[PDB]
Structure 1
Amino acid sequence: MFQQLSARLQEAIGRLRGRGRITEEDLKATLREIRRALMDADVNLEVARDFVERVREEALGKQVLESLTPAEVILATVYEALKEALGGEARLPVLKDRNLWFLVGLQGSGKTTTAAKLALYYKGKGRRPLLVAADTQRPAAREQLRLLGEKVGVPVLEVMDGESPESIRRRVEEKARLEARDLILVDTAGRLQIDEPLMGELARLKEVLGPDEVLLVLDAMTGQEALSVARAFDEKVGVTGLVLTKLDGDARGGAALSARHVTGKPIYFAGVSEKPEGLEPFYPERLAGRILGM
């Protein structure tokens, strides 16, 4: 994953391999290349500075200038730096008997596809999901989820035009109660940009529906710019976790590496394809190892 970054990080580190002990000027050259690699991957400035800082300082603390295999030392410290940036320990929502989740984000971020992906994911984990197309102004948006629900074999409750959050709540609670659905996935409305009035409806919907999780869906391809809306959603609504989509089309990885710093929210899942099966729980340690070709 993150082809360009993986290639560059590995190339930079390899310069310290197969040539005996290295000089600090040798180390500095590799450190500068790593820094350039991060900047080119669209990684947050502070994250990049911190990254290289600890790689250097940790390597030096591990007597890298005296090691007979210095590239292995740097690889290890680069792995720890990567792991930190990605989130440390993997995290996933803790499900209970009743689970109502909100999928929020701008249009095109991958909300509808992710809703279905999550339905299919938990469907095979002992859960009975219910998809809810909550756009009370755009019928076309609701239809999109309707078709997807069919493909994944998961029921889709469509809200009616202008339906009040109270009517939506009672209708969802009824369907879920009568059909034994323990995982409700609400696909909320979204525009190409943050809409104040729309954000007001969203907050009101949260108040009435009382979601257990509020997943902010982010298109990794938009770079670190994708994280700009995070603050707005958390203040007005309250984001509990993130979903990074289109990671299969992201060669940089800037959004994934910067999410932690900028948003302070954990990444629960990663979208790795346009297909309903293209969903994977976010694993910081696994991803760090992959990027470094481990």
Structure 2
Amino acid sequence: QLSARLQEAIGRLRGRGRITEEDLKATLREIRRALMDADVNLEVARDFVERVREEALGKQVLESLTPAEVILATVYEALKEALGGEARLPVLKDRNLWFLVGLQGSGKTTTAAKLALYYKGKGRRPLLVAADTQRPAAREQLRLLGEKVGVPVLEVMDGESPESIRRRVEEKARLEARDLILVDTAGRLQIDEPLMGELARLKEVLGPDEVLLVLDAMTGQEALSVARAFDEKVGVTGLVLTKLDGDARGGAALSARHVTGKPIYFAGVSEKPEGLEPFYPERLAGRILG
């Protein structure tokens, strides 16, 4: 399963007995390069191999008779941990309101319907909220998806205030006894201050319990910078990684976790409402390294 590059780096060192510190640094340099190829941000990839270095030495890799096995195990182990360790799903309570936030076209509208269907199946009574008034047909988009998964959709009006939104949502959720409110917000640049302000004010007024950063698996080096800005300017609580049905390696997930420390709750694995899975750190660790 391992990548061409890493098959060589570790293969080199098998059967040689003990290895030198130079051999370690040479290896860690190849792991670094491999992570950058897997779209891990370059500062994060630097820090990641420095973490590996400490752990490998803390396993006395210099004295080991199978040090290439030690190194490779420690990469697999450190990357799994850095991606969250074990599968972790959100903890729901009696009242639940979540935002879906992020960059343009990352999969927020589609993911909202996926979550609605997922939680419907678990006795939740979701409400979808079409809060994107700019993207053409965006409200019809979520309405059609809502109809497919058998979940109601509240559609925000043009120029409607957050206060008026809170009001109509509180009203419908109560009158319909709905305990999972899914707010689909428009994609925006992390540097677009008025729109990042709009999102912070919407958070301020609506008080979501979760704010899910929807991140496309093919996102490159800006992932760090994007995750940081959303979390500083708005405050993120969790992550959804989309388009994992592609062949992008998904290194942006490590960048996002590195700078935010937030869990990656879900994976998106198709265009259809069924295409949702719990996220498994180990599974993506393998993907990044393969």
How far 1:149 moved relative to its partner? 1.4
Within 5 A, what are the aligned runs for 1:1-294? 6-18=3-15, 20-138=17-135, 140-191=137-188, 194-288=191-285
What stretches of structure 1 of length at least 5 have no aligned partner?
none
How far 1:110 moved relative to its partner? 1.0
Distance 1:14 1:137, change over 3 A: same
How far 1:48 moved relative to its partner? 1.8
How far 1:95 moved relative to its partner? 0.6
Distance 1:71 1:230, change over 3 A: closer
How far 1:82 moved relative to its partner? 0.9
Distance 1:155 1:194, change over 3 A: farther
- Point out the more displaced range, 79-88 or 215-224: 79-88
Separation of aligned partners in 2, 1:196 and 1:241? 22
CA contact (8 A) 2:250 2:288 kept: no
Distance 1:136 1:55, change over 3 A: closer
What stretches of structure 2 of length at least 5 have no aligned partner?
none
- Point out the more displaced range, 112-121 or 232-241: 232-241
Separation of aligned partners in 2, 1:55 and 1:32? 11
CA contact (8 A) 1:220 1:226 kept: no
Q: 1:177-206 CA deviation, whole Å, 9 max, x = no partner?
A: 222221010101234675433333323322
Separation of aligned partners in 1, 2:174 and 2:121? 20
- Point out the more displaced range, 94-103 or 258-267: 258-267
Separation of aligned partners in 1, 2:51 and 2:137? 50
CA contact (8 A) 1:16 1:30 kept: no
Separation of aligned partners in 2, 1:217 and 1:93? 15
How far 1:291 moved relative to its partner? 5.2
Distance 1:251 1:9, change over 3 A: farther
Q: 1:180-233 CA deviation, whole Å, 9 max, x = no partner?
A: 221010101234675433333323322222211111212221213134233433
Percent of pairs identical after alignment? 100
How far 1:68 moved relative to its partner? 4.2
Separation of aligned partners in 2, 1:226 and 1:180? 38
How far 1:32 moved relative to its partner? 2.8
CA contact (8 A) 2:250 2:287 kept: no
Task: Give the TM-score normalised by the residue count of structure 1.
Answer: 0.85
How far 1:22 moved relative to its partner? 4.5
How far 1:111 moved relative to its partner? 0.8
Q: 1:86-140 CA deviation, whole Å, 9 max, x = no partner?
A: 2345443221011011111222011101111111221222211111101234561
Separation of aligned partners in 2, 1:61 and 1:199? 43
Q: 1:231-274 CA deviation, whole Å, 9 max, x = no partner?
A: 43334432222222223325333201211223343322222222
Separation of aligned partners in 2, 1:146 and 1:11? 51
Separation of aligned partners in 2, 1:204 and 1:291? 36
- Point out the more displaced range, 252-261 or 79-88: 79-88
How far 1:51 moved relative to its partner? 2.4
Separation of aligned partners in 2, 1:234 and 1:63? 38
- Point out the more displaced range, 262-271 or 176-185: 262-271
Separation of aligned partners in 1, 2:82 and 2:13? 23
How far 1:39 moved relative to its partner? 2.3
Distance 1:77 1:32, change over 3 A: same
Distance 1:178 1:215, change over 3 A: same
CA contact (8 A) 1:117 1:279 kept: yes
Q: 1:10-52 CA deviation, whole Å, 9 max, x = no partner?
A: 5433333355555555544433321221222232233222322
CA contact (8 A) 2:32 2:49 kept: yes
Task: Give the TM-score normalised by the residue count of structure 2.
Answer: 0.86
Distance 1:194 1:291, change over 3 A: closer
Separation of aligned partners in 1, 2:130 and 2:179? 17
CA contact (8 A) 1:75 1:292 kept: no
CA contact (8 A) 2:83 2:253 kept: yes
How far 1:78 moved relative to its partner? 0.9
RMSD: 2.8
Distance 1:224 1:292, change over 3 A: closer
Q: How many positions carry a matched residue from both structures?
A: 290
